[PDB]
Design a protein around this ligand. Sequence first.
Ligand SMILES: Nc1ncnc2c1ncn2[C@@H]1O[C@H](COP(=O)(O)OP(=O)(O)O)[C@@H](O)[C@H]1O
Length: 413
Amino acid sequence: NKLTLDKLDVKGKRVVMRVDFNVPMKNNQITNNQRIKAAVPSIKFCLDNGAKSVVLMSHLGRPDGVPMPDKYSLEPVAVELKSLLGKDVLFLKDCVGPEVEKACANPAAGSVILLENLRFHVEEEGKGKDASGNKVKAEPAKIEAFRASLSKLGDVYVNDAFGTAHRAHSSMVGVNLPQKAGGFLMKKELNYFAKALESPERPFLAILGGAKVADKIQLINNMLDKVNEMIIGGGMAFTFLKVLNNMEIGTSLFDEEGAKIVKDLMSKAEKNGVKITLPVDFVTADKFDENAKTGQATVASGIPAGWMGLDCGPESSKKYAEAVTRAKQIVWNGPVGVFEWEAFARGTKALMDEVVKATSRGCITIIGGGDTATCCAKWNTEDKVSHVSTGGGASLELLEGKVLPGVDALSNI
Ligand SMILES: Nc1ncnc2c1ncn2[C@@H]1O[C@H](COP(=O)(O)OP(=O)(O)O)[C@@H](O)[C@H]1O
């Protein structure tokens, strides 16, 4: 087991906390601050328990090892943090080097400091692109020095950056202080997924949809050993329907690599008695456009040529609803339609309503982060499901049964 924040004595201690502040932006201004909010409990705790300082560190976007302050600065996060925290947050313009080090040697008894975006330095990811756009690899010597500089900012280290936990980056596995402790966001996320995967309340339903039909492979195969039911929705379904049922799918998303094992996966489900729910009907579109001409189809009719299926239909949502009703526990990863467009958002909307009714009655509902977490924000259901993950990719690594380098890097009790 690992050291965690509650076990950690901070009093008088400078805390360098890795957090995931990689919030969606538009035109420099934050569109979702959930990732920020989620870190608050760890930060406050340190403040309330007498920390000399919290020096926060994160990445935003993918600047690829070149500094891009015009486009990917964390400054706006500082402003949000201070508002959240009802306290001052001092933003630094770099994350390493003498100046930053001076700022972080001995702050006051409670000063919050935010570092600039980690990824401006190629040493964080260990690789990136140079200013001319060329793929480059960072240098071991330079990587150690970078790692050393982060080390100085703090007496002790805390990782609350669950969403970045799958990334073996310098700030996540390279900060070599004596005590490295997992924050409250880390413990909470890990605990939910672990409980859901190891000892779920049953029946356990996984809802898989979205697009990323191929990446959902290791995931389904693992889930197939954990679950009692699975909805396979959204873009992914079409590959299953064409293969199993010889559906005419038009221009709908199709995944050739995926089509190869669809039969294997289905037989595994049959073996395990996992009831698989695929869509039986669809909202079609004449083109991939918000204002496209719409239509309806079924597995049996096909989708016209060469229309595409962009939402499930009414029968499908009902069958989805039947599964939600039976479930004691739900993991939902991926929307079941192109929810960003009104024409194609009904199936997702109806699924959200059902999941929401289920929470209400004690079904454990876990939402996968990424696009699904986005639906919650959009529709105000963030506080009406048991947990909305802050990490899409990291959660998948977890659902896939993989280990997280961010978790592993922590100190052992
Ligand atoms: N039938 C469909 N055809 C094409 N795109 C779809 C379909 N259903 C959902 N999508 C798209 O899938 C995306 C979500 O993909 P993904 O990243 O896998 O979900 P998440 O981020 O929740 O894990 C959205 O951009 C959505 O518009």
